[PDB]
Amino acid sequence: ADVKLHGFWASPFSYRVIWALKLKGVEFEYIEEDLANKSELLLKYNPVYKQIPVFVHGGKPIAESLVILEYIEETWPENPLLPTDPYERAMARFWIQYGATKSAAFGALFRASGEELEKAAKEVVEVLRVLQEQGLGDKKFFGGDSINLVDISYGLFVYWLAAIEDIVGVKVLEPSTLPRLHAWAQNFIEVPLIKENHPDNDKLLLHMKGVREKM
Amino acid sequence: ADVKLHGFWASPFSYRVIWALKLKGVEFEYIEEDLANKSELLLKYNPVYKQIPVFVHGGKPIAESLVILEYIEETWPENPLLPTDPYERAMARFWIQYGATKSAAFGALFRASGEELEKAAKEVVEVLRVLQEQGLGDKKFFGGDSINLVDISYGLFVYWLAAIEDIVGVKVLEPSTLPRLHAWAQNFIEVPLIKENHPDNDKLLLHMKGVREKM
């Protein structure tokens, strides 16, 4: 059954799926979607959200990156991206859900006014501290010695932190404040799979700087 | 390994876990938590959210009802509450996630002012229409001929609809507007497992009416 991925060049959600497929060694056709003029296939495949990514396997579509990632893990179980033990799997799902819930704080910091900025940055630092202390601990990656679906889901945090630093100017992931999480972020971007698969940084900063003009 | 459940008498989230355990035939000790004075075990077991439910198995805790439900399904796989096929499992997770995301609209309607009420009720009806058309379809339950984790996760919607109708007075799940979803709601409350396990309706309406005094 052939695999298609409808994505967007600057989307971290589309990149989550690219990472999981490339890790599994699953060949796929990538389809770049124009978000200003959504394709007939995108609207047919994702009527509920009308968003990318849309993963298609054997002509059958799946929307929502977290749902797609679990389908990929179940369909191509070799090179596992989740643990086999139910309790460890529940801890992985717990941290993936925590990230999804707290993702709103990153967008809030990105659009915060000159005054709102201090409180927004404070809330992001506390989210990162809990993630570091209770989620990562002393492990190299959320997945232990190699990346797993938890690391993949936290690519979105790295994407936001780098955009807030380069465009806004506030630093929320500092080595002296969060040494373990900062070491994790550096180690994650150095994983060859990640290094080989990410938006062009200059093009991404420019696009995101322009998107921030919503104020 | 013994099973404990830290819950709250009026919590639909605690009831999701009770339903799944009773369906699986798993014996458990139930611990009623005083939300005004959280127990030492609750704060130790759920430091991230400090919320019930907290499920404990072999002394190991799990927080977040959706995470707990998947652990129960994986640990006691007999009497399955999720399909075995990855694509059907992905559709179940998709609809469970849709419910979690849209749950905020129900709280919004519950606390809406006399003016906000019309727009809040409109947004809830559209959430229910998409759930009915694209999620339930012509099936008796989200799980087909019997309830599954999707039906269990949508107990929360039934809890809200009955509270909005009895206290506020607005009807958002009408038989002539949503015939299939209304038939589903009636069929769900008639399932003996559900009928035997829910908060005392009079006590629940009174508690919720008092909680609505946050305006």
Residue numbers in the entry:
A (entry chain A), B (entry chain A): 2 to 216
Task: Show me the paper's own sentences about this structure.
Glutathione transferases (GSTs) constitute a widespread superfamily of enzymes notably involved in xenobiotic detoxification and/or in specialized metabolism. PtGSTU19 and 20, two paralogs sharing more than 91% sequence identity (95% of sequence similarity), would have diverged from a common ancestor of P. trichocarpa and P. yatungensis species. These enzymes display the distinctive glutathione (GSH)-conjugation and peroxidase activities against model substrates.
The crystal structures of PtGSTU19 and 20 were solved in their apo form (U19 APO and U20 APO ) and in complex with GSH (U19 GSH and U20 GSH ). The H-site of PtGSTU19 has distinct properties. Nearly two-thirds of the helix α6 of U19APO (residues Val159 to Gly170) were refined in two conformations. The first conformation corresponds to the one found in U20APO/GSH/GS-PAP with Trp161 buried (ASA of 10 Å2) and a deep H-site. In addition, the side chain of Tyr160 points in the direction of the assumed catalytic serine residue (Ser12). To our knowledge, this is the first time that this helix is observed in two conformations in the apo form and in one conformation in the GSH-bound form. Two-thirds of the α6 helix is flexible in PtGSTU19 while only one conformation is observed in PtGSTU20. The disorder of this α6 helix could explain why it was not possible to obtain crystallographic structures of PtGSTU19 in complex with flavonoids. In any case, this region (Glu34 to Lys51) is one of the regions with the highest B factors in PtGSTU19APO.
